[PDB]
Design a protein around this nucleic acid. Structure first.
Ligand SMILES: [K+]
Ligand SMILES: [K+]
Ligand SMILES: [K+]
Ligand SMILES: [K+]
Ligand SMILES: [Mg+2]
Ligand SMILES: [Mg+2]
Ligand SMILES: [Mg+2]
Ligand SMILES: [Mg+2]
Ligand SMILES: [Mg+2]
Lengths: 70, 102
RNA sequence: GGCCGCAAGGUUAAAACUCAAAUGAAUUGACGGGGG
RNA sequence: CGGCCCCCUGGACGAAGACUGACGCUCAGGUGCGAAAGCGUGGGGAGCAAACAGGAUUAGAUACCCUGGUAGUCCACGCCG
């Protein structure tokens, strides 16, 4: 019953405090992203230069949730 | 007798020592600038500088990130120091650059 | 802001904002580069 | 507040009486006193010692350790509170 989330790919440019990250997407836009609850429960570390999948929402195109680290 | 005197006059030359500074791949600007002032001091006093850079875990995947720090240090101390052992590969979980005065 | 002081500063003394705690004593463990 | 001696001087306590006759208790403002560091103006300076200088230790060591060392610590008068 929820609205759909578009998933994009991107690179981690910068680690910010408390599981927050600047991520450049393929389109060229930088977004501030936070780790998903699955990834933090299962201890999947994210670092600078990592490639990630970012769930975005149409309500705010400056924010995202990192849902996978390749 | 004595000559100890003459030794003291010979001693007021110099002995070179090696001062180790250790960076990391992610080290912020302020904290970089502190460690640079340590190196400037050592080199202006005529001492060698063993600049290390360590990696942990999966920081080794992004080796290129670490390399640029050592390149940044080198280019900031270009006028003061000469390079003596610019690294090639990660030996262990470390890379070691050695600088020297002038 | 007032008063005091050569100065350092002292004294009198708020509000916006933010949090659901902060705190005292005692209890059972664990820990100590404390003791036996 | 600590050697000994002299000079000036404040309070406390005990024993027996005599005397005054509630003259008391507490105190906002006020006034005084108030460790050490610190400040001003003059002195003094053995020992000690912020700052500082050198020697070390260390991944680094603007420290702890070592050799030195100025203010200060002492005196008079004032301030500070
Ligand atoms: K004031
Ligand atoms: K409050
Ligand atoms: K014990
Ligand atoms: K002196
Ligand atoms: Mg007396
Ligand atoms: Mg004093
Ligand atoms: Mg004085
Ligand atoms: Mg001394
Ligand atoms: Mg000393």
């Amino acid at each position: 019953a929820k609205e759909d989330n578009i998933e994009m790919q991107g690179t981690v440019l910068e680690t910010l405090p408390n599981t927050m990250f600047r991520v450049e997407l393929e389109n060229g836009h930088v977004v501030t992203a936070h780790i998903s609850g699955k990834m933090r429960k299962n201890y999947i570390r994210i670092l600078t230069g990592d490639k990630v999948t970012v769930e975005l929402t149409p309500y705010d195109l400056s924010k995202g949730r990192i849902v996978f680290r390749s | 007798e004595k000559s100890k005197s003459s030794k003291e006059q010979k001693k007021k030359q110099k002995v070179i020592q090696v001062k180790e500074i250790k960076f990391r791949p992610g080290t912020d600007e302020g904290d970089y600038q502190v460690k640079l002032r340590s190196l400037i001091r050592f080199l202006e006093e005529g001492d060698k500088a063993k600049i290390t850079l360590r990696f942990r875990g999966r920081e080794m995947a992004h080796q290129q990130i670490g390399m640029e720090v050592l390149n940044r240090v080198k280019d900031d101390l270009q006028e003061l120091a000469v390079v003596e052992s610019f690294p090639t590969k990660i030996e262990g979980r470390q890379m070691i650059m050695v600088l020297a005065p002038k």
